[PDB]
Amino acid sequence: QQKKTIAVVGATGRQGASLIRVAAAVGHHVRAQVHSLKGLIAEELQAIPNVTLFQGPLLNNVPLMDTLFEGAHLAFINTTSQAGDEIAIGKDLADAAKRAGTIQHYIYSSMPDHSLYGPWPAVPMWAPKFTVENYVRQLGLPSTFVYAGIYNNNFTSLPYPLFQMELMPDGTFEWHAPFDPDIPLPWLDAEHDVGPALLQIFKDGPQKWNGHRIALTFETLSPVQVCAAFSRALNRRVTYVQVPKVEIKVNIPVGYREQLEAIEVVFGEHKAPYFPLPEFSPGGVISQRVTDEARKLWSGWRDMEEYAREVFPIEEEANGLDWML
Ligand SMILES: [Cl-]
Ligand SMILES: [Cl-]
Ligand SMILES: [Cl-]
Ligand SMILES: [Cl-]
Ligand SMILES: [Cl-]
Ligand SMILES: [K+]
Ligand SMILES: [K+]
Ligand SMILES: [K+]
Ligand SMILES: [K+]
């Protein structure tokens, strides 16, 4: 059958870019919204024949949304709080897809509202997405919701918050974070694995996935295990250190700081699960693991050890770091 056109919001982001590259390669035409045509990713995607970019802001720009969905049959939507009004943009996009009438399957990248499952605060950049999910669920078009695990490539030795693989004077690495050293966290190789997984959801179809929540995570590892993966990968001493507060070594926008403080409370103080929804956690009885559906969607997923050994050194050198010589 003719590969269907996919409308994408979040094209230059890790999830969108991953989907777009593989989707185009297998024949899908893509209509993607971007803030601006400039940028390494935007310029890269613009050069893919099957991809068409539409520049402009989404905030209060229903016309751009209508244009985006024109002639599209599939949609992958991942919004951001940066411009603010993420909830309004999410609803506007959903309504726009419905109005188009041609969208057969709408995939929205959602996150949990932790305040619904315990004496925990809602993580500011996550909870809003769940509100959009609830709204999307009530629209007449088939929809599926994917929950992204922590990006393997968040790790960097640059002084950025939460996921810094700090290079010490002796050449060893230390990762400091509020997470409990031994509680398994959900991870994800966004660049390589998000795209293939999303395409399989699209290939499976709306009858199989309408109304479903899928955890896009292929590997769970505690912080100590992540560091052990880097250690084996790099042949260097890498150790995890639990800290009460996130070490914020650089200036960050106010919204991110609030995101980090919520994280300190949720994972630091409370040790709550990353994915707190109940569905995410006798002879022959076998309970579903959080990584089961994702692995079934895409069997060629890559682990943390592969990232640390094969990609981390390149990304680091690309950022100007020198430890890899
Ligand atoms: Cl298709
Ligand atoms: Cl098109
Ligand atoms: Cl532009
Ligand atoms: Cl479909
Ligand atoms: Cl540092
Ligand atoms: K193009
Ligand atoms: K529905
Ligand atoms: K309705
Ligand atoms: K997500």
From Swiss-Prot:
Q: Which gene encodes it?
A: nmrA
Q: Kindly list the places in or outside the cell where this protein is found, as annotated in its UniProt entry.
A: Nucleus; Cytoplasm
Source domain of life is Eukaryota
Assigned keywords, A-Z: Cytoplasm, NAD, NADP, Nucleus, Oxidoreductase, Repressor, Transcription, Transcription regulation
**Result of mutating residue 191 to Q?**
No changes in the Kd for NAD and NADP and almost complete loss of affinity for areA
**By what name is this protein known?**
Nitrogen metabolite repression protein nmrA
Per the entry, induction is:
Up-regulated in nitrogen-sufficient conditions and down-regulated in nitrogen-limiting conditions.
* Entry binding sites for NAD(+): 14-15, 78-80, 129, 151-154
Species of the source: Emericella nidulans (strain FGSC A4 / ATCC 38163 / CBS 112.46 / NRRL 194 / M139)
Any Gene Ontology biological process: nitrogen catabolite repression of transcription from RNA polymerase II promoter
Record note on what altering residue 264 to Q does: No changes in the Kd for NAD; NADP and areA
Q: What is the effect of changing residue 12 to V?
A: 4-fold increase in the Kd for NAD; 7-fold increase in the Kd for NADP and no change in the Kd for areA
Signal sequence, renumbered to the chain: none
GO MF annotation: an example: NAD binding
An example GO CC term for this entry is: nucleus
Family affiliation? Belongs to the NmrA-type oxidoreductase family.
What does the UniProt entry report for the null mutant? Answer: Displays partial derepression of activities subject to nitrogen metabolic repression.
Q: What's this protein's function?
A: May be a redox sensor protein. Has much higher affinity for NAD(P) than for NAD(P)H. Has similar affinity for NAD and NADP. Negative transcriptional regulator involved in the post-transcriptional modulation of the GATA-type transcription factor areA, forming part of a system controlling nitrogen metabolite repression. Interferes with the interaction between areA and target DNA. Overexpression leads to areA inhibition.
* Phenotype when changing residue 202 to Y: No changes in the Kd for NAD and NADP and 2-fold increase in the Kd for areA
Quaternary structure?
Monomer. Interacts with areA.
| Positions of NADP(+) binding | 10-15, 35, 78, 129, 151-154
Q: InterPro entries from the entry? A: NAD(P)-bd_dom_sf (IPR036291), NmrA-like (IPR008030), NmrA-like_oxidored (IPR051164)
